[PDB]
Design a binder for this molecule. Sequence first.
Ligand SMILES: CC(C)(COP(=O)(O)OP(=O)(O)OC[C@H]1O[C@@H](n2cnc3c(N)ncnc32)[C@H](O)[C@@H]1OP(=O)(O)O)[C@@H](O)C(=O)NCCC(=O)NCCS
Ligand SMILES: CC(C)(COP(=O)(O)OP(=O)(O)OC[C@H]1O[C@@H](n2cnc3c(N)ncnc32)[C@H](O)[C@@H]1OP(=O)(O)O)[C@@H](O)C(=O)NCCC(=O)NCCS
Ligand SMILES: [Cl-]
Ligand SMILES: [Cl-]
Ligand SMILES: [Cl-]
Ligand SMILES: [Cl-]
Lengths: 504, 504
Amino acid sequence: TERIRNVALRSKVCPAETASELIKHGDVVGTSGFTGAGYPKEVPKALAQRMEAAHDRGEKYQISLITGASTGPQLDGELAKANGVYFRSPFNTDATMRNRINAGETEYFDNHLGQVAGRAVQGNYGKFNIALVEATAITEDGGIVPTSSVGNSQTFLNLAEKVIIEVNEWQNPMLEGIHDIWDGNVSGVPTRDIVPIVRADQRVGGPVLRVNPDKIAAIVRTNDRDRNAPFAAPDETAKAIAGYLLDFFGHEVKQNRLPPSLLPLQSGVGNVANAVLEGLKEGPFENLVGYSEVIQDGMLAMLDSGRMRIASASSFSLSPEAAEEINNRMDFFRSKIILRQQDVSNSPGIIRRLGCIAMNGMIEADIYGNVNSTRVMGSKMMNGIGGSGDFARSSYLSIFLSPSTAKGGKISAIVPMAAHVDHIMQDAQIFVTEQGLADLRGLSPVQRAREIISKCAHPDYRPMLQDYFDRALKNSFGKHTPHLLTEALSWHQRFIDTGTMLPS
Amino acid sequence: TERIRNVALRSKVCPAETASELIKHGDVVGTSGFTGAGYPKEVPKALAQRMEAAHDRGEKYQISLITGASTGPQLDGELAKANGVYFRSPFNTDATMRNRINAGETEYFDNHLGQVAGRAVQGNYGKFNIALVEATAITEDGGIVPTSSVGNSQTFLNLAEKVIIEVNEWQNPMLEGIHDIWDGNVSGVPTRDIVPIVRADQRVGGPVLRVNPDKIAAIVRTNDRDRNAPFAAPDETAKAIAGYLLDFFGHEVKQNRLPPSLLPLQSGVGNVANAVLEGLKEGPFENLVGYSEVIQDGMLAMLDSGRMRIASASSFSLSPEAAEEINNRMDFFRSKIILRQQDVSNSPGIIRRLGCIAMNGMIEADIYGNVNSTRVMGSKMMNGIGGSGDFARSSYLSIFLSPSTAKGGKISAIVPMAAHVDHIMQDAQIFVTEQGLADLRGLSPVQRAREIISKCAHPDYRPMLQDYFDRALKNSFGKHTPHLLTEALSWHQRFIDTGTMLPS
Ligand SMILES: CC(C)(COP(=O)(O)OP(=O)(O)OC[C@H]1O[C@@H](n2cnc3c(N)ncnc32)[C@H](O)[C@@H]1OP(=O)(O)O)[C@@H](O)C(=O)NCCC(=O)NCCS
Ligand SMILES: CC(C)(COP(=O)(O)OP(=O)(O)OC[C@H]1O[C@@H](n2cnc3c(N)ncnc32)[C@H](O)[C@@H]1OP(=O)(O)O)[C@@H](O)C(=O)NCCC(=O)NCCS
Ligand SMILES: [Cl-]
Ligand SMILES: [Cl-]
Ligand SMILES: [Cl-]
Ligand SMILES: [Cl-]
């Protein structure tokens, strides 16, 4: 059936290429897209071509690209191969775009996902020229129905001078109704509203993005698939980590420090976080509730089980085999899920109010439990802080999950001093590896160290860590948080210098 | 007139010393006290004596001491001289207690002030045995009227098994009515309430702390003064910092990025933050609003001016000369001020909703704008993170203020890499020194560095910083956030090694 149900706007359809010409050099461009779901696909490819062309003729052609979160190959990928982005924000997982960022070719700054909207409205990123948003359909009265994510779309539509909509008939029409967009002022000019979300399954707004039709300069019909990263089956390390965490939960429930149905759960994606979710499905806990950034395959499974009553997120991030399952009983799942604006799904006030249990991965943690989420050796960007900082600081319990080693043994997940800090000690309470679970609740730095080292570190690095501690204790400039400054970062420089952390 | 207006509770008055015997060894003790205002004074002194005594006879006598924030000599001071605290939290400024912490003699963990209550209720600090709260008066129906701060008092009263109240006739009786205590569930068991503060001058609760009278084991009559740290007059460096910030404000107002009356202001205390406030009083801005942790002399002056309509905080922190002024027209000021629970004054949801401008000091910042608020050389505790993390991450604008050098030139406020991280890049946007103002809005790490270095660093260190950058750029393991790991911390080790950061 016909996707553009507003009669007049049909008059605004043109081809991807013609739409692309609307985007000038130096434009700040806000787009939909979040964990490889619901980003514009055709216009960006078209824009790439024209950029490569204009480059080969010695003329400048680059844009500022602000998304919800990570996009996919058609957007981040293409625009990067074509050297088309001078500034990116706030979160990328594209290999090509990564290399561009790490080479200094694209300026990057990974803001907290929950704050991007507010900073955009504040003017931090400059005036927005284009909003480029993918849509399932346009309603009779001109509402834009989002696709597989909501992200920052509503904010970009309100800020941008001109708007381009891609109506993608690949997206399932029954996504319509799954979203909840708030009418008022979430991240605008203070004083902001109270967004009265008091329960994860609650709807406070409507199913469509709102925009002055006059700003819609172009509507492109499309049919292209999302980036559907495939199911990374849990290995031995991940299964082990799940085990320790489910034990800990079972114990918290026994001590009456959590109810039998736990609290609202936020997990990321990985094989790590993915395993935890498989653990929970078989585990003893029932009536679970997700209040996450993302709905991944795990949550889908439990929504099916009945193990999870409801899941709230800003986007999907399914695998081909999962995506397929949902498209069938999309009528069922539609009623167990809610997709919200990312500034609502990552609202500190709401996360804290619901008491979320945050479960996030990490590069590395130092012995005092500071966390590195982003910059390998402290300088080389991986993905970005994302929403881990939103959930870690705001959650009821802040849990970090990781294997004890990276690079088949050559890197220790636990180190003397993290090369980059994303989450300070205050923002991390439970660490889990395949070695064991550290519980830092109520501890001082020094006691945090005993816990992390003896519970989490790998046998091969435990001793060296213990040694770093013991001597640091004796010699540190202060004894409160003891450090040997001359060899704090040394384990890193040693990897930089020899490709391993183990020494001679 | 009589302070204990509940007739029956008068039957519970005893002397400080007898009350002190209620506190056993190994007790977890929650007390009032916040920025040297409204902490218990007589019972602690009494407890110290008895601790020194029991020590001299070879018996163990120590408590866990949880406050609102910093207390004063009668409490933190005394209990420290007597080696009486085994664990402290969450924020201290007492010299003796500091030394104890830095010597490993007291275990310390500086939680975010806004989160202390929630963590207490969660059980992180253990079961609470005693709550020891100073009071202005007890109402006819048994309400506890707080004194010069509210802090965590209400939570401690609800958690503690036994309660001891010090009714201190030194405190002004007309403090009664100035407080706003919320009846519901701010930091308790999820799901928590919406605390509907939508405006800084708004009252949402009542003027008294509530507690089962039966838990009140003892009421001690007292008459002793608060720690009234004296007015640290603004010097040349501070006056300069104020100047740059007031310029920046004037400019934001011109570009219509802030209204003429700015937004709700949060400043700490120091000569630094103190100067800013004197700047504002004379400046062009009117109709100002404080939504802070603390009311210091600056805000008092403007409340007098009419320059500030209203100020919200969790405590006072006045100087003798200021304290004197307010005690006179206490009827006037009472109506311009509101003291709230610290978990309300430092609520992320509310700070973000009101769009606060946060102005905090710092030890040091690295070139990429990470901030150190706590640990000199990364190991030696100073005060604690306090509420700087609550306000920085949640605020509309996050400003840090500091002189470019510490220790008469021997330390640079800006360094290659901060020894300890409290506030990540994301959480800091404006830096100001007596050199200049850096505006990092929308910049990548590398552009952040150009700004900080060229605007903020001291001439004597600028060159060495620039050199550290330039070479790091060429050689860093990644080019996104460039670092020379072997000399990142070097400027610090150099001070540790020679007492200066300047080299040979
Ligand atoms: C930090 C993060 C990369 C790790 O998560 P993960 O799924 O477990 O990733 P892995 O541990 O399996 O490996 C990721 C990469 O980082 C590398 N890595 C992991 N630890 C490392 C370390 N201590 N040093 C260097 N590299 C490391 C891995 O080798 C791997 O590299 P590869 O692609 O070349 O094989 C990821 O969680 C992330 O970027 N988090 C940021 C934001 C976030 O948490 N949002 C919520 C969920 S989407
Ligand atoms: C960071 C903080 C300690 C400095 O504030 P400040 O009093 O204005 O700074 P000052 O330079 O005037 O004095 C602070 C002390 O730290 C020292 N100091 C400052 N910078 C330093 C540095 N880079 N290295 C070592 N010491 C330093 C000063 O010499 C001074 O030491 P001393 O008085 O023992 O001789 C203080 O702001 C704080 O603890 N903040 C944490 C919590 C907070 O911001 N909450 C908000 C309301 S207060
Ligand atoms: Cl809200
Ligand atoms: Cl804690
Ligand atoms: Cl709230
Ligand atoms: Cl920004």
